[PDB]
Amino acid sequence: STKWYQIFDTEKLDDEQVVGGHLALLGVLGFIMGIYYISGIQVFPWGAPGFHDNWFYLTIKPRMVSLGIDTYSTKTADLEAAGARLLGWAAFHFLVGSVLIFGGWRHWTHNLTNPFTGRCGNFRDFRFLGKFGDVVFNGTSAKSYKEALGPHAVYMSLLFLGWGIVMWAILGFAPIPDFQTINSETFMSFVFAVIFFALGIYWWNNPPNAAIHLNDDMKAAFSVHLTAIGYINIALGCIAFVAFQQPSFAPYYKELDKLVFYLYGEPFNRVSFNFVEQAKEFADFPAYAILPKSGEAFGMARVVTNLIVFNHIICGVLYVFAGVYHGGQYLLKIQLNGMYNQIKSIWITKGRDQEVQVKILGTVMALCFATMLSVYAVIVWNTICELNIFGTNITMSFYWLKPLPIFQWMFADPSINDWVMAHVITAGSLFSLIALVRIAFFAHTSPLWDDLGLKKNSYSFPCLGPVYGGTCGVSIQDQLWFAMLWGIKGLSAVCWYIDGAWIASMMYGVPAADAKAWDSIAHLHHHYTSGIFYYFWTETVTIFSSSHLSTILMIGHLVWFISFAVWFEDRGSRLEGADIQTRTIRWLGKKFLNRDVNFRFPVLTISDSKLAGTFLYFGGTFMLVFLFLANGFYQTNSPLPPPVS
Amino acid sequence: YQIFDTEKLDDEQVVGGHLALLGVLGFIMGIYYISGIQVFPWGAPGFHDNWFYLTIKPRMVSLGIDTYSTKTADLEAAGARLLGWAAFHFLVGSVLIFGGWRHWTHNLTNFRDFRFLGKFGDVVFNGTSAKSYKEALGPHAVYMSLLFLGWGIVMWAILGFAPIPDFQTINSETFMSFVFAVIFFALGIYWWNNPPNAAIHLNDDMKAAFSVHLTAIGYINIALGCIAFVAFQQPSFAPYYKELDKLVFYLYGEPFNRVSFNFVAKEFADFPAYAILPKSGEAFGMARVVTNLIVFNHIICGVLYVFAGVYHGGQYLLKIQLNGMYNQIKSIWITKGRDQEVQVKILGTVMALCFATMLSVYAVIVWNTICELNIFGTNITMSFYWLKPLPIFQWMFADPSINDWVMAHVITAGSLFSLIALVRIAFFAHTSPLWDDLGLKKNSYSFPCLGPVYGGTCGVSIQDQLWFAMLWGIKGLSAVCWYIDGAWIASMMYGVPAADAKAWDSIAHLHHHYTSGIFYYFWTETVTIFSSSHLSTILMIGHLVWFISFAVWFEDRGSRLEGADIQTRTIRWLGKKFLNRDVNFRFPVLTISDSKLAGTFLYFGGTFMLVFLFLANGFYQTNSPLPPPV
Amino acid sequence: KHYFIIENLCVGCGLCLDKCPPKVNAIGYKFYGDVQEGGFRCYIDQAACISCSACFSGDECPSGALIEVLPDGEVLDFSYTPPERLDFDLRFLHRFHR
Numbered sequence A: 001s002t003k004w005y006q007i008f009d010t011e012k013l014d015d016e017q018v019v020g021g022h023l024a025l026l027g028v029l030g031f032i033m034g035i036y037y038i039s040g041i042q043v044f045p046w047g048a049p050g051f052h053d054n055w056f057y058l059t060i061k062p063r064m065v066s067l068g069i070d071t072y073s074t075k076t077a078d079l080e081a082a083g084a085r086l087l088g089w090a091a092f093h094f095l096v097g098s099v100l101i102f103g104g105w106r107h108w109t110h111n112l113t114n115p116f117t118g119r120c121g122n123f124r125d126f127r128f129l130g131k132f133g134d135v136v137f138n139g140t141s142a143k144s145y146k147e148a149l150g151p152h153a154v155y156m157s158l159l160f161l162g163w164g165i166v167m168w169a170i171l172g173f174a175p176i177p178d179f180q181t182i183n184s185e186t187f188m189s190f191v192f193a194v195i196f197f198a199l200g201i202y203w204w205n206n207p208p209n210a211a212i213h214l215n216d217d218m219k220a221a222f223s224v225h226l227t228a229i230g231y232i233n234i235a236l237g238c239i240a241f242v243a244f245q246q247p248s249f250a251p252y253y254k255e256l257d258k259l260v261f262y263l264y265g266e267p268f269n270r271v272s273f274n275f276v277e278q279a280k281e282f283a284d285f286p287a288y289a290i291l292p293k294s295g296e297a298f299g300m301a302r303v304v305t306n307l308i309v310f311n312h313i314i315c316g317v318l319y320v321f322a323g324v325y326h327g328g329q330y331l332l333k334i335q336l337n338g339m340y341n342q343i344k345s346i347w348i349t350k351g352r353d354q355e356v357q358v359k360i361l362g363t364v365m366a367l368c369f370a371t372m373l374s375v376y377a378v379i380v381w382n383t384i385c386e387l388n389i390f391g392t393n394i395t396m397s398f399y400w401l402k403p404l405p406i407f408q409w410m411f412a413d414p415s416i417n418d419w420v421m422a423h424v425i426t427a428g429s430l431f432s433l434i435a436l437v438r439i440a441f442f443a444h445t446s447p448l449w450d451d452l453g454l455k456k457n458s459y460s461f462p463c464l465g466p467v468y469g470g471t472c473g474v475s476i477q478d479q480l481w482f483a484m485l486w487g488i489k490g491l492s493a494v495c496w497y498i499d500g501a502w503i504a505s506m507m508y509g510v511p512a513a514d515a516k517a518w519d520s521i522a523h524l525h526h527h528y529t530s531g532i533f534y535y536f537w538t539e540t541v542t543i544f545s546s547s548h549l550s551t552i553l554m555i556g557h558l559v560w561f562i563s564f565a566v567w568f569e570d571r572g573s574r575l576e577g578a579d580i581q582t583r584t585i586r587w588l589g590k591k592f593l594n595r596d597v598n599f600r601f602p603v604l605t606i607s608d609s610k611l612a613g614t615f616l617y618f619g620g621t622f623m624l625v626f627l628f629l630a631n632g633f634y635q636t637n638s639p640l641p642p643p644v645s
Numbered sequence B: 001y002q003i004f005d006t007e008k009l010d011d012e013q014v015v016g017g018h019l020a021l022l023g024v025l026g027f028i029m030g031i032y033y034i035s036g037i038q039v040f041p042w043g044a045p046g047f048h049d050n051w052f053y054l055t056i057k058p059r060m061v062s063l064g065i066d067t068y069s070t071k072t073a074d075l076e077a078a079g080a081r082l083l084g085w086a087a088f089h090f091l092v093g094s095v096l097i098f099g100g101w102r103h104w105t106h107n108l109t110n111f112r113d114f115r116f117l118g119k120f121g122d123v124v125f126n127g128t129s130a131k132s133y134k135e136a137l138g139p140h141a142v143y144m145s146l147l148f149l150g151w152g153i154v155m156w157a158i159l160g161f162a163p164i165p166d167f168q169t170i171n172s173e174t175f176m177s178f179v180f181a182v183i184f185f186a187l188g189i190y191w192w193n194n195p196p197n198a199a200i201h202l203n204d205d206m207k208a209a210f211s212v213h214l215t216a217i218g219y220i221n222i223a224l225g226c227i228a229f230v231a232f233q234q235p236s237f238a239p240y241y242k243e244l245d246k247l248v249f250y251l252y253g254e255p256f257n258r259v260s261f262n263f264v265a266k267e268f269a270d271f272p273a274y275a276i277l278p279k280s281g282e283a284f285g286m287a288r289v290v291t292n293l294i295v296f297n298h299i300i301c302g303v304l305y306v307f308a309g310v311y312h313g314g315q316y317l318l319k320i321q322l323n324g325m326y327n328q329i330k331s332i333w334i335t336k337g338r339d340q341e342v343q344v345k346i347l348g349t350v351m352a353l354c355f356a357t358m359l360s361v362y363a364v365i366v367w368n369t370i371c372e373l374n375i376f377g378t379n380i381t382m383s384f385y386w387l388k389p390l391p392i393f394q395w396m397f398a399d400p401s402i403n404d405w406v407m408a409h410v411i412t413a414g415s416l417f418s419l420i421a422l423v424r425i426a427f428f429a430h431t432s433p434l435w436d437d438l439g440l441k442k443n444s445y446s447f448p449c450l451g452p453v454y455g456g457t458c459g460v461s462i463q464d465q466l467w468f469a470m471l472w473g474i475k476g477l478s479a480v481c482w483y484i485d486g487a488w489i490a491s492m493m494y495g496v497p498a499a500d501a502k503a504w505d506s507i508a509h510l511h512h513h514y515t516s517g518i519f520y521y522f523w524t525e526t527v528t529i530f531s532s533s534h535l536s537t538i539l540m541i542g543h544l545v546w547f548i549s550f551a552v553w554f555e556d557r558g559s560r561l562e563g564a565d566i567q568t569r570t571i572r573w574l575g576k577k578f579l580n581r582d583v584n585f586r587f588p589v590l591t592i593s594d595s596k597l598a599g600t601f602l603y604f605g606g607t608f609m610l611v612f613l614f615l616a617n618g619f620y621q622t623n624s625p626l627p628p629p630v
Numbered sequence C: 001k002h003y004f005i006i007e008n009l010c011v012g013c014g015l016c017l018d019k020c021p022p023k024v025n026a027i028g029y030k031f032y033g034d035v036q037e038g039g040f041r042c043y044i045d046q047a048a049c050i051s052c053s054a055c056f057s058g059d060e061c062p063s064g065a066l067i068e069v070l071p072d073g074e075v076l077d078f079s080y081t082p083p084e085r086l087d088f089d090l091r092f093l094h095r096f097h098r
């Protein structure tokens, strides 16, 4: 059953096909970057105003400031220079992306003919360049992914050297080893060029061997690289959060708070029902014009930092989940093919014994249960103490429980909030890892399905029926969906922590007494925005204030409770209801149609119902989390006084 | 959950269970009565206040058992009366439980033929019993006549109320109780002279009679809820309700008198440490709060009773379809669904009308939202503000507006939406047109899956359709709650800080400022909830129950089963490691039918646990309309 | 050909029905008892079922009840079963996995 999400599946694609797809994607990404750069032109070089501060460009902006582009200037001439540089680099991106799309089409058609020299370049054998390829490799990687890592690292070294050159000439950043200032990223680009050239030549002369991927690279290598790059993206998000909070990046990020922005959808000055433009609130600005939103109050620096960090973090988590799912698909393929017993590598042979799988998954489950129970009991006890039910004041809460002084170096203000954040992240990581391990090990047969004589014969089978009163969602696809739903909690913890919230309790800052006395008894110079449940109330003030954020709120909520319809165990009910719908639509016969209504009402397959349900669930959840991170930072450095002295 | 199945119980078992339950109801009624005595005759401080007692209180004020008076001696006399009536309820409930145990356990002396108050039990019912249910309708009506007459004579004798027939006093209740006793006696004597003819409930009928009576009682409860909402709003009932606005109420779980940490300091002077802080009834609108609680309790109980009556009727229908009795019912209540073509017509018509009206009202709501938030450059003049109930229908609503139109259309759409599942239960209990086309019939009231086939066949059974009916009626019940709490259900964000959000009041010229739109209602009710620790705890517990429901809702039971096998292996290995050969504790995972049962239980439970907070936070609706934004 | 299904092994999932053309309708459910305890199984009508082999070639059976008898008489639970292997683990003494 080849669906519309299986036509681009790698099993049907070759190496050249995916090369062409990647190049087409790179070119389209360059075109999108040109769109964004144009969208960042604050004042047009024509002599006219510009675009209204898209979130895409507001994210892109500080990086551009790091370069010679995009001055943080209110001066109109310098801002026009910023627009000119942005537009020029956008046009350059457009040209390069067009050429990349052309190359991607050539590699998609397997039609590699140079117009100037009428020769056909073989994908399996060639020289990278006229002389450079003969200088370094003397040939081509022999159609094996392990042999390509060398040339790939050499190409990455070339790209790093080119980036250094571009910074040196066009952007005018002379490499010096001062890492606090901007003009060392080019020096480190050159250092990385040297390092990666050495690594590439070593891996070309000595290819590393993990022979699992080479055979069906299309899924095994895809899964391994996707999980690795997901962890890389998580690391990049962490590094970004640490660095954007550093004073070294401050000239490029804190100044974002100094300047105000006119955002698309930010509330406009409201005219009355009778405005004779031939009554208007905020008359100095023109009618239906966006009121400026001050960065200092909005915390635009941390808002952009949070958008970047959580974008990379969630993309990395999703990439990890997809890598595990695609590795499970490959493992199921080799399990049905009989190659699972023939892999001969540590990454499979260790999991070949089902008892080792049981031990690993049981250890993960025990750690998850223990950590989750500990942290959840702490959270609910803090909530109980601050709401004072059962006659417990916050002196009985876990305010004493700070991180260890040895481990206190990596927190701004040591508190129970950081403790609960770390414990929740570990618990959610293990919680998702339960399902990831299930995908990794139980792609074909679980120990239960070993005891009970069933086996999973597909990556997208719904279930095995009502036998044993169960069998729902044992497919690796369904385990991926459960892993995503379980990691929703961890990603939510990440977002709420980076935005600023009391995760150690649920209702922190509510008009209750001991909820307000938390800061008094905790000795914190940071006033966290609010507790878990009070976070919505405190941070929806802006979301309601802004019509655009409210529209996103409504759409995400609709998406979520439409996911509800396909998530539940109701597919048969929907099928019979659709048959009734079809029968009444046929009853539009004898309503003067004289037209045979050949329209059977469709109902998604369970393997498709869970797919749609998870997609809409995640989509609504994080369309709303975008508003969480776009409401504002709203963290004031002022401890709360006790309600009663 | 089937341990009191009707087929397991005889008629006498049902009588005994009902008697025991009426006795325990009397016991809990006494519990509430002693839970509401403000000041004891002892003189010691008494129970603060309970939503149970704050619900009961207007009735006690109407009856004179308790008073709203502001005198300590008056409240002490009221508490003495309350304690006396609670003791009476305790004793009579104990007697009723005694009868319930003497009837659940068949130990008396003639249940097939007996005598009831023989001295005049030979005058009525010829000195014999009601052999069957058709013969039992008569004596049941006469017994209810005796109940009404007893209420009348008790009200006259013990409560000391006049028989005056004017309908603006409790004397009206006395006079109408006597009239109802007479009317019930007439109905019962006619039914004894002529038993009814609905034979389907005269064969094996426990489940059938129970289902039809539960549906009738559920519709009666919805009618009672509407009637109570209208009457509790009437000025004639105002002396018993609007005084809730004029009084202060100290409720459990309210913000205590906040103590210091170096205290032997307190927030409020002269109110001791950890003391429930006073609340003004005008701020809460406690009259509207109490009537909301009562009316919504009745409405949801009626909805649930209707749903369960349809479900049990579907159970009986499957029973009589399995043994071939379905095809020989002479009662019209089966002949209109036996053809299996009228079933398709009815369900398709209901689906189509529900679709049309629901799509219309949803489009209206979203267009109101778009004109609110000025999305795509739409002013407030582009909304459905011209759209109101017609003057012919305007007498139904006070302050007619788009709010009332959307409420009526939404409640009708929700009724039809739940009726889709109710009709699916009612007609496709054994045979469905799809399942007749597929060649597969059904045989159990709870078959959850029937396997992944034709894409999957989850949730076809009668029980699963009951769960879906409850799920879809959650929206209708939410509409009822949000209308009785004053929410602007016509749009999504009304009165919100935004463009053209207040403007509604300047556009519709409303004399009543509604609370908030759909999404701004949560904010504007939680601003008051978060003050209360009790409502906050209910909030969190309800959400906890709600999301724990999803572990059994989703199509995930098999994943849970293999995970439970893994958990069992882990537990066995560990318990055999640190302890000697202890082998036990298989992890129990609920079956898919039971999984749906628990999931619906938790979903409904949490959802309406939170709707209780909606209806108990306060009314917070002002008569002064919002100004234009200009 | 003459495909059979072992109801003792079958658990009643009905993917054979999805793999069967609607015009033939060879796969059918047979109910025995409680659905949650295994209940219904599936059966093939030999006269109606005419050598499509879609069911077995799809290799969708979890229970291995879907069997194919051959003219010479051999029976197949799966199109290609993995080979049976003498399993025994590897641990290098000086490497980190010891």
Ligand code: BCL
Binding pocket: A008, A009, A010, A013, A017, A018, A019, A020, A021, A022, A024, A025, A217, A218, A219, A220, A221, A222, A223, A225, A226, A229, A315, A318
């Ligand atoms: C960080 C870099 C990642 C990576 C990021 C991406 C991204 C991003 C994309 C691909 C795409 C593809 N990649 Mg990749 N991929 C990685 C590693 C690999 C490896 C490997 C190492 O073995 C292989 C074999 C592939 C193979 C493939 C194909 C499935 C496909 C390109 C060929 C084709 O013509 O598509 C035919 C179809 C098209 C090229 C375009 C179809 C239309 C649109 C653009 C598809 C969008 C899908 C989705 C919304 C992408 C969203 C990303 C999320 C927002 C986080 N990837 C590395 C590790 N790859 C694209 C693909 O199609 O994904 C399904 C794609 O979106």
Ligand code: BCL
Binding pocket: A026, A027, A029, A030, A031, A033, A060, A061, A063, A064, A067, A089, A093, A096, A097, A100, A155, A156, A157, A159, A160, A163, A166, A189, A232, A236
């Ligand atoms: C590549 C596909 C698209 C494209 C899409 C993008 C995207 C997407 C972005 C830019 C952005 C940039 N683009 Mg571009 N752009 C393209 C073509 C070009 C070309 C060119 C001649 O091909 C040039 C000179 C530029 C120029 C630039 C700069 C103005 C700017 C910052 C570059 C930089 O920091 O790189 C840093 C260079 C290096 C790190 C070395 C080279 C890459 C190495 C070998 C790969 C590993 C690093 C990888 C990028 C990150 C992974 C880190 C992990 C730890 C492994 N674009 C094409 C058409 N462009 C950025 C932006 O605007 O920022 C706001 C940005 O994020």
Ligand code: BCL
Binding pocket: A210, A212, A213, A219, A220, A221, A223, A224, A227, A228, A229, A231, A320, A323, A324, A326, A327, A328, A330, A331, A346, A347, A348, A349, A350, A351, A352, A433, A436, A437, A439, A440, A441
């Ligand atoms: C470490 C570098 C890469 C990595 C590289 C590879 C490679 C290479 C392969 C896989 C493959 C698989 N990957 Mg991986 N994978 C990583 C992260 C993950 C994570 C995760 C969330 O941590 C998961 C769940 C998976 C999931 C999976 C499975 C689908 C599959 C292995 C099945 C098996 O039997 O394993 C058995 C389990 C193990 C062998 C576990 C022990 C791991 C190593 C060998 C031993 C030392 C590490 C020690 C236990 C931990 C502490 C020290 C570490 C340095 C932190 N990958 C990271 C990102 N993965 C294989 C597959 O077929 O892909 C399609 C494959 O070829």
Ligand code: BCL
Binding pocket: B022, B023, B025, B026, B027, B029, B055, B056, B057, B059, B060, B063, B085, B088, B089, B090, B092, B093, B096, B144, B147, B148, B151, B154, B220, B224
């Ligand atoms: C039988 C179960 C329990 C019991 C449990 C309860 C419960 C539970 C409640 C009361 C309540 C009350 N009970 Mg008591 N109570 C019992 C025994 C008594 C005795 C006694 C003679 O011993 C007395 C004097 C009372 C007196 C009272 C009042 C103080 C108070 C209001 C009654 C009133 O409105 O009735 C009016 C009486 C009638 C109208 C009699 C006829 C009843 C009709 C038929 C009920 C259904 C009507 C409905 C519309 C459906 C009709 C369907 C068909 C068309 C026929 N109870 C026993 C011990 N008591 C109420 C309360 O506290 O209010 C706040 C209340 O709801």
Ligand code: BCL
Binding pocket: B004, B005, B006, B009, B013, B014, B017, B018, B021, B024, B028, B206, B207, B209, B210, B213, B214, B215, B217
């Ligand atoms: C008047 C409206 C309803 C009606 C209302 C009810 C209600 C309501 C209940 C019954 C119950 C029963 N009904 Mg009935 N009953 C009606 C007409 C009928 C007819 C008929 C037409 O002849 C029949 C055959 C039956 C048949 C039956 C039995 C299945 C069962 C009695 C057995 C027993 O053990 O229950 C006794 C069982 C209980 C003790 C357990 C359930 C009740 C709760 C858990 C315990 C009561 C204490 C309470 C929680 C304390 C309050 C605490 C405060 C909230 C803090 N009903 C009509 C249709 N009937 C009861 C039963 O459980 O049904 C399964 C039950 O709860």
Ligand code: BCL
Binding pocket: B198, B200, B201, B207, B208, B209, B211, B212, B215, B216, B219, B306, B309, B310, B312, B313, B314, B316, B317, B331, B332, B333, B334, B335, B336, B337, B338, B419, B422, B423, B425, B426, B427
């Ligand atoms: C008005 C009186 C009662 C009523 C009385 C009965 C009786 C009596 C029985 C059922 C039975 C059933 N009830 Mg009922 N039922 C009512 C409300 C409902 C509702 C609902 C509207 O939500 C539903 C879904 C059900 C569900 C069901 C089914 C489980 C079952 C009927 C199956 C079928 O073939 O019906 C086909 C029938 C119909 C399509 C409707 C028949 C209507 C008849 C012909 C009356 C004239 C209709 C006319 C428009 C009314 C004008 C007003 C005049 C004053 C009469 N009941 C109300 C509360 N119901 C049967 C069962 O087995 O119970 C266990 C049964 O014998």
Ligand code: G2O
Binding pocket: A365, A366, A368, A369, A372, A373, A374, A376, A377, A431, A434, A482, A485, B547, B548, B549, B550, B551, B554, B556, B558, B559, B560, B561, B562, B563, B564, B567
């Ligand atoms: C807080 C609420 C929740 C739990 C408590 C819990 C417990 C749990 N579940 Mg869950 N879950 C959801 C919520 C909760 N699921 C939601 C909203 C969804 C919708 C998508 C969902 C879905 C799936 C799927 C699809 C599968 C599972 C499993 C699986 C476990 C197996 C072992 C494990 O994870 O150990 C890790 C241990 C934990 C997960 C539990 C530690 C306690 C903690 C401190 C919270 C305590 C909450 C509460 C106070 C306890 C009740 C006491 C009182 C209130 C009466 C396992 C212990 C499955 C398996 O058995 O294998 C993994 C499986 O297949 N789920």
Ligand code: G2O
Binding pocket: A558, A561, A562, A564, A565, A566, A568, A570, A573, A574, A575, A576, A577, A578, A581, B351, B354, B355, B356, B358, B359, B362, B417, B420, B468, B471, B472
């Ligand atoms: C906005 C949210 C929803 C709908 C829109 C909807 C549409 C719908 N569903 Mg649903 N559903 C849930 C939400 C929604 N279900 C939830 C949260 C659960 C979890 C329990 C759930 C579950 C079940 C089960 C188990 C069954 C169904 C059916 C059934 C229908 C058949 C005919 C009917 O009822 O029309 C009445 C319903 C309509 C008038 C819907 C059409 C306009 C609308 C007014 C609002 C328009 C919203 C718009 C389409 C969204 C995007 C617009 C644009 C971007 C394209 C049918 C039209 C089944 C049947 O076919 O028969 C009833 C069946 O068995 N469900």
Ligand code: SF4
Binding pocket: A462, A463, A464, A465, A466, A470, A471, A472, A473, A569, A606, B448, B449, B450, B451, B452, B456, B457, B458, B459, B555, B556, B557, B592
């Ligand atoms: S409920 Fe649905 S997904 Fe679960 S076993 Fe039954 S048919 Fe399969």
Ligand code: SF4
Binding pocket: C003, C019, C020, C021, C024, C025, C026, C027, C044, C048, C049, C050, C051, C052, C053, C054, C055, C056
């Ligand atoms: S072989 Fe052909 S006819 Fe027989 S069951 Fe399979 S698909 Fe149906």
Ligand code: SF4
Binding pocket: C005, C010, C011, C012, C013, C014, C015, C016, C042, C060, C061, C062, C063, C064, C065, C066
């Ligand atoms: S695929 Fe196997 S388990 Fe499923 S119905 Fe066919 S024979 Fe039975």
Ligand SMILES: [Ca+2]
Binding pocket: A499, A539, A627, A628, A629, A630, A631, A632, A633
């Ligand atoms: Ca925020």
Ligand SMILES: [Ca+2]
Binding pocket: B485, B525, B613, B614, B615, B616, B617, B618, B619, B620
């Ligand atoms: Ca309220």
